[PDB]
Amino acid sequence: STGSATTTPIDSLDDAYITPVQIGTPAQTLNLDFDTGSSDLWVFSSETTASEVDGQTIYTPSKSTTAKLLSGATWSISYGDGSSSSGDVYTDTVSVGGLTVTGQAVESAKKVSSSFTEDSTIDGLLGLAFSTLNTVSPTQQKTFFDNAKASLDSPVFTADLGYHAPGTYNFGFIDTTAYTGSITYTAVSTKQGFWEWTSTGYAVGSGTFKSTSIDGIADTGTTLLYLPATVVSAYWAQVSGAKSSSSVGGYVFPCSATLPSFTFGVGSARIVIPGDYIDFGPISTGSSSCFGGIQSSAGIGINIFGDVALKAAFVVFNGATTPTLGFASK
């Protein structure tokens, strides 16, 4: 089997991407944030505290003839941005782009933190990291991809995120028309539960490539590119007037600037992020200070190849017995 679904930016900055997902019988379609940095499929629901729902579409398990309470199971998750959610668990039929999994754990939110409530466009998350990170207790549950894998034509999914435009998540096949050149594959460590790999270096604009190992994660659920402070300083030093602002929470730059590109290495190959992809617009409405799309990871504990980086590439998440990542230009 295969599946193919379009993923759409939630706003004009590509702050996140939503993908329609069918849950239950008859189908209830919710727009989920596919997140290769976590491993829970959770949804706003008829069980979510009413004051914490503000415009989201909810899953109502009592209206699904295939929903079953997973008795005794609870979940609770905290994300790197400080947001969180928790609740109980149903199993139900879940389909993405024509690919159907029966018995998928659907984690129903009883509580969500303010940033989820405040984002009316995201009805939940669909985790695509390794199932060892799944938070369901006392019986850990598998991701949608893990459940689908054996049925897929090939044990892979691909992320093809657009810049200010829709893109595609494919399951079970590699669309050879969706990229240019060849795909360069690179080793993955699953020791932390992430799609963790080592970039071979970087360049700023037309500058020379610096060969240096940068361990980080391919994370579709993180907006920006978070890299070591040395690398980030070297980038922003090429933008007149750019500075790190403790009050804003990162590097800002004059909105009048033209940003240089940023290149990252994948083995001997190179992925070029155009400068425009690094512009996240005014820090507040009407400001002439703009927020940068490349930020320091120093306070995180891990480097994160988020959407800013991934949207410059066609990315293969190879879930073979030994997982690997592939990157191609497009």
Phi, psi of 325 (to 5 degrees): -115, 145
Can you read off the two tokens belonging to residue 232?
């980030």
Beta-carbon-side half-sphere exposure of residue 113 (alpha carbons within 13 Å): 10
The amino acid that residue 298 corresponds to is A
In this structure, the chain runs to a length of 330
Contact assessment for residue 280 and residue 13, using Cβ atoms and an 8 Å cutoff: yes
What is the per-residue burial (b if ≥16 Cβ within 10 Å, else e) of 169-205? bbbbbbeeeebeeebbbbebeeeebbbbbbbbebbbe
DSSP codes of every residue in 15-63: --EEEEEEETTTTEEEEEEEETT---EEE-BTTS-GGG-SS---B-GGG
**Nearby residues of 176 by Cβ (< 8 Å), 6 or more positions away:** none
Q: How far apart are CA 47 and CA 269, in angstroms?
A: 48
DSSP SS3 for 62:
helix
Contact assessment for residue 293 and residue 224, using Cβ atoms and an 8 Å cutoff: yes
* DSSP letter (8 states) at residue 59: B
Pairing status of strand 28-35 against strand 124-127: parallel
Contact assessment for residue 42 and residue 87, using Cβ atoms and an 8 Å cutoff: yes
35 as an active site residue: the answer is yes
Pairing status of strand 184-187 against strand 84-96: unpaired
Rg of the chain on CA atoms, in Å: 20
Can you read off the two tokens belonging to residue 225?
């590119």
DSSP codes of every residue in 101-113: EEEEEEEEEEEE-
Q: How far apart are CA 6 and CA 257, in angstroms?
A: 32
* DSSP letter (8 states) at residue 297: -
CA 132 to chain centre: 17
Burial class (CB in 10 A: 0-12, 13-18, 19+), 130: buried
Contact assessment for residue 204 and residue 260, using Cβ atoms and an 8 Å cutoff: yes
Q: How far apart are CA 293 and CA 306, in angstroms?
A: 10
CB atoms within 10 A of CB 159: 23
Contact assessment for residue 327 and residue 277, using Cβ atoms and an 8 Å cutoff: no
Phi, psi of 107 (to 5 degrees): -90, 115
Q: How far apart are CA 72 and CA 53, in angstroms?
A: 24
The amino acid that residue 1 corresponds to is S
Q: 220 - beta bridge partners?
A: none
Question: Active-site residue among 14, 35, 88, 219?
Answer: 35
Q: In 60-98, where do the E strands start and end?
A: 68-78, 84-96
**Nearby residues of 237 by Cβ (< 8 Å), 6 or more positions away:** none
Structural domains in the chain? 5-174 (2.40.70.10), 175-330 (2.40.70.10)
Q: Which helix (H) or strand (E) holds 308?
A: helix 307-310
Q: How far apart are CA 88 and CA 135, in angstroms?
A: 11
Unique residue bearing structure tokens 């049925």: 151
Q: How far apart are CA 248 and CA 252, in angstroms?
A: 8
> Nearest-CA neighbor of 235 among 290, 278, 191, 178?
278
Unique residue bearing structure tokens 């927020």: 291
* DSSP letter (8 states) at residue 176: T
- Of the chain, the end-to-end C-alpha distance in Å amounts to 25
Question: Active-site residue among 45, 131, 199, 296?
Answer: 199
> Nearest-CA neighbor of 262 among 276, 252, 251?
276
> Nearest-CA neighbor of 94 among 156, 160, 49, 143?
143
Contact assessment for residue 329 and residue 179, using Cβ atoms and an 8 Å cutoff: yes
Beta-carbon-side half-sphere exposure of residue 148 (alpha carbons within 13 Å): 27
Q: Which helix (H) or strand (E) holds 272?
A: strand 269-273
Q: How far apart are CA 315 and CA 173, in angstroms?
A: 12
288 as an active site residue: the answer is no
Contact assessment for residue 61 and residue 108, using Cβ atoms and an 8 Å cutoff: yes
> Nearest-CA neighbor of 47 among 36, 55, 59?
59
Alpha carbon separation from 21 to 18, 32, 84, 248, 306 (Å, rounded): 9, 7, 21, 35, 22
Q: What is the resolution of this structure in A?
A: 1.0
